[PDB]
Amino acid sequence: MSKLAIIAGDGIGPEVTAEAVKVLDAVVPGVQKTSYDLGARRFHATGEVLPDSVVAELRNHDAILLGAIGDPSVPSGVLERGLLLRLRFELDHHINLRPARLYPGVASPLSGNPGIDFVVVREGTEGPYTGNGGAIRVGTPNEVATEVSVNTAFGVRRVVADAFERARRRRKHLTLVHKTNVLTFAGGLWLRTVDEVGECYPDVEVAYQHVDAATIHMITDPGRFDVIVTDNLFGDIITDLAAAVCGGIGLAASGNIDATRANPSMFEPVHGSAPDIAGQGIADPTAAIMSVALLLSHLGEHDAAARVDRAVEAHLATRGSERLATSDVGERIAAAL
Amino acid sequence: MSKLAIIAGDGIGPEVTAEAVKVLDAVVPGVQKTSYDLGARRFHATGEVLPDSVVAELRNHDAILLGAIGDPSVPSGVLERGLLLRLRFELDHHINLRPARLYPGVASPLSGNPGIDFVVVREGTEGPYTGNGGAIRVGTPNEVATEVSVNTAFGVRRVVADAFERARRRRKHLTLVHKTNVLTFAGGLWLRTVDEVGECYPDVEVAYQHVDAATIHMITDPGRFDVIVTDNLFGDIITDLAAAVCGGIGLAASGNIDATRANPSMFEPVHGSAPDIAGQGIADPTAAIMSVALLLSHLGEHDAAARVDRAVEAHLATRGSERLATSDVGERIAAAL
Ligand SMILES: [Cl-]
Ligand SMILES: [Cl-]
Ligand SMILES: [Cl-]
Ligand SMILES: [Cl-]
């Protein structure tokens, strides 16, 4: 560790990030924390979404911890395209890491408390989610709109390697999810890349599923997954579905990772800013604290990451249906370190 | 009255289609049936997949009933592209109808057998599941592969207008599912079309969800859905998920509809040809027979469909668990007709 940039952000972001920082501070004292004003607040106060100068500041830190971004006062798509996706592009966050574990003390919407323990590695910087396309004759019966997905061996190989590495360190099973029968170009790039990278991992079993069939299995047989690798668009959907089967996006954490370490990687809870309860001390910081565990693991603070994991798991196992304030949750987790 | 084209097809196609035909003319008298050897048989027999002479022949019937196509026997893609997709595009099947109901006697993989009854209207003839794209420098670190989704006012309004009608005639709720914040061109088109079409349907409440959200809600709160309208790519994913939560693709029916009636529409059970049980009279013919009810309800023949429905429901609500042969299940469905 050493230097952490903190982007507490909007609505519930501050109050959950404060509890995350507390847990970090307990397992790794004397980290330099630097706080950046980004999102709705910054957007109103200055007109700025993501200045290049702020991006450069961000580079001076070992990692970034983010809370949540967004407010109904700021238009729909703007911070999301201009701050969230832009940071992902500018910091080369090509690996979106989305763990999906079902924990004692958490209800699944699936029948019969199945064992669920997998990880999704989503490609973060290419494919359909870059804004490539256009329209003509807008607002007429003659309108035509095109969306273009660009995929590269550069991009794909990166993310696939990382997923194989994760698979080797876990249960040695990798599932590629795509739609190769219909996206024959992107799909074939993905298939061949997994096969070629797979040559270096004769220990990892590799399977393939179409995204519609994988969606079905996540509901009927989620125990079959160890590591899933996929693209930006399909990953967007299946990481949220994973979260849902593991008891909701409110209990999910995310890494946005440049595996070359050339740039600092960013960690956050998956949930959003929930402005209707902002400042009230209701928001659960468990997700934010679980993102701290990801961050620590990424920085090689593995013993300290295990400690946070164990302390989250302990909290979830005894919380029950008790009404717990944001700071009561943070205290319970802290006391279990 | 009616001319039906029948393409039993491959593997278990013949067997479940035999039942559906049996059900059919036992509720509508003068159905003039024509058999079509299309699929693996025809291919192996002749080399033919779907000659133009044959499409022109199909156009002279009032509907098409299909069982299944595909065999490992036939090289990947030959029939799916050259028969199945080609028929969809040639016959202008712009509406893909995928009803989603959890019936009595059917166990859902979701918690607490919840209320689920909705319909998915999926755009059928545009988007990226068209084959539009390419690659350069294949098989090198410099490989780049593109997929292109073409979306039109023409294609979109038709599908959307058909959805609003389905909504009116049901619980007057329509959900548009897309990803408008990042597929900004396609997204904008779909949004604006739903708004504009919806001004002849003030009876219909209109809701928007991003596809990632919809997938979460399909598993945590599927009861909030009546009609879903979406594009080809997102519909392909959400249709399979709806089936799963309503007890499986094995119990799902699909309409492929030219809502201008210039071409005959096609109806089929969702499941494939299952080469592994071809000819053992094991295959369950229920969905094939559910596909007849959509074929009927589309041809204006409400009461024969209104019936046939009930005979299927009876079948499912009373089957218990005993292994039934194809022809048995077929015979059972008669009774309540
Ligand atoms: Cl956020
Ligand atoms: Cl991992
Ligand atoms: Cl996201
Ligand atoms: Cl309907």
Curated annotation (Swiss-Prot), chains A, B:
Pathway: Amino-acid biosynthesis; L-leucine biosynthesis; L-leucine from 3-methyl-2-oxobutanoate: step 3/4. PROSITE patterns: IDH_IMDH. GO terms for biological process: L-leucine biosynthetic process. Its cofactor is Mg(2+); Mn(2+). The keyword Cell inner membrane does not apply. Binds 1 Mg(2+) or Mn(2+) ion per subunit. Keywords: Amino-acid biosynthesis, Branched-chain amino acid biosynthesis, Cytoplasm, Leucine biosynthesis, Magnesium, Manganese, Metal-binding, NAD, Oxidoreductase. The record marks Y129, K179 as: Important for catalysis. It catalyses: (2R,3S)-3-isopropylmalate + NAD(+) = 4-methyl-2-oxopentanoate + CO2 + NADH. Belongs to the isocitrate and isopropylmalate dehydrogenases family. LeuB type 2 subfamily. This is 3-isopropylmalate dehydrogenase. It comes from Mycobacterium tuberculosis (strain CDC 1551 / Oshkosh). The gene is leuB.
